[PDB]
Write a protein that binds this ligand. Sequence first.
Ligand SMILES: O=c1nc(NO)ccn1[C@@H]1O[C@H](COP(=O)(O)O)[C@@H](O)[C@H]1O
Ligand SMILES: O=c1nc(NO)ccn1[C@@H]1O[C@H](COP(=O)(O)O)[C@@H](O)[C@H]1O
Ligand SMILES: [Cl-]
Ligand SMILES: [Cl-]
Lengths: 256, 256
Amino acid sequence: ELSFGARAELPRIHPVASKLLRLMQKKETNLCLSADVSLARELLQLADALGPSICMLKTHVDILNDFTLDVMKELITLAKCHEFLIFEDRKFADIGNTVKKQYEGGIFKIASWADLVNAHVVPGSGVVKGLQEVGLPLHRGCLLIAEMSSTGSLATGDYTRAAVRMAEEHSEFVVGFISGSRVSMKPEFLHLTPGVQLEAGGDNLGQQYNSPQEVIGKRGSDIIIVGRGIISAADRLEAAEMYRKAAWEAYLSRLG
Amino acid sequence: ELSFGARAELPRIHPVASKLLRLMQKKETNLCLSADVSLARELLQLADALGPSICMLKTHVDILNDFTLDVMKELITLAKCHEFLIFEDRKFADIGNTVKKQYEGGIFKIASWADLVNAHVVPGSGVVKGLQEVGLPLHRGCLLIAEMSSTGSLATGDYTRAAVRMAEEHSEFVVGFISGSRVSMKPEFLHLTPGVQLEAGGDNLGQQYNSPQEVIGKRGSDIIIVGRGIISAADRLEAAEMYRKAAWEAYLSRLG
Ligand SMILES: O=c1nc(NO)ccn1[C@@H]1O[C@H](COP(=O)(O)O)[C@@H](O)[C@H]1O
Ligand SMILES: O=c1nc(NO)ccn1[C@@H]1O[C@H](COP(=O)(O)O)[C@@H](O)[C@H]1O
Ligand SMILES: [Cl-]
Ligand SMILES: [Cl-]
């Protein structure tokens, strides 16, 4: 079990994973904020206020009512100032020829500003191969969806194993997984886990929740992704701090 | 085998599926153009020129460099003048609360203009449940992705069967499937098949092509989806007519 700091130095580490690991160590945070908001001013207010507490901000640019590239330019200034990576949760899941265009072009120009994106593995490795053509020149990384937090998820068994294999065969671009627990023993790969809250439960339209101690300390994941557990709290600063301390202490416990 | 006209009257038949089947009958076309272009001017010129040859125009709004809602308003007008449905190939693939905002809101407001959208089934029925909450009041329909055309597709076997059962359980919203062949015996469901060209082959990023005669005649799908086979030809109108004749003649042949 290596520290984040030491994994940032592994000979085979991807530069983006290495950059994320060094900043998680420096800032003592393994918390990704799911910035699930509809206005650009909310997204920038949250990134500025909660930046110090997080290693990563996860966006859904396609839910922003007033997206412009100038919003993303301002987000990058905040990511650079407070030191976190930007993860656009686009869940690419088309053939390689189409995802390449969806990643580089259209109105969002996602590769122009997202350090990380994710993809489903259901199309086969072409999905990774098309993204890579755009993301490698721009020094970008991708996470593959190995498992899902939601009820009825088909991302189990042989499907998870295919995501892991795909990741090993594309490690110049794939830096880890979205998953509910550690799915690879290779320490170069990051594991990010959504469906996290301090309290048990907690469905609604299919989502399921586990605590930071369970997913970090017991299930061996690296980073927790939290949206509503922070964003719906009265005091989002205190809430972000609670999740950061929970996830950081669970990670320390695991190192022994 | 029922004709398209007759299927338009199955009792169990969605009104969107009915509208589509009647216009396929009337126009003698079971061709969906995949309008994979990056400029509004080209998208709308193809929509107008090829409108008479197709039953459906399939978009990737997120690759359109000069997207505005005014462009989609013009597309609706051509869909009404020429009679074809608009299918946004967004491959929704997220938890329920997320996909509902991806469908209704953001800059694209997909539900406001797209007759049809599609979704992956990997997250479980939560994906359909989120879209359906938006789509039912707006009298929209959805396709589920039961199979994929690309090398390495994990949409096979139990996965595909999971997709069919999900469509059965959400039949007031789900109008059929994206798949390589007939996956359901119910004639109320439509089957639309991408990965189609007159020539055997593939691209350099995992796309595989089969002929109209193979997919409509032998595999018993309903509609061919064709992008490059048409968009790359010098005369896209001639090309769309070749594909329309081929798919329609193949449909006649399966009817005896
Ligand atoms: O990163 C993810 N990986 C997923 N695969 O399981 C699924 C959802 N997500 C996103 O993680 C966020 C979790 O939010 P809540 O903590 O339930 O409010 C949402 O924006 C989801 O769309
Ligand atoms: O190729 C696909 N395969 C699918 N499943 O295999 C689903 C949709 N598509 C879309 O179908 C179109 C096929 O394009 P070509 O016909 O391969 O240019 C593209 O826009 C793809 O994104
Ligand atoms: Cl890597
Ligand atoms: Cl491939």
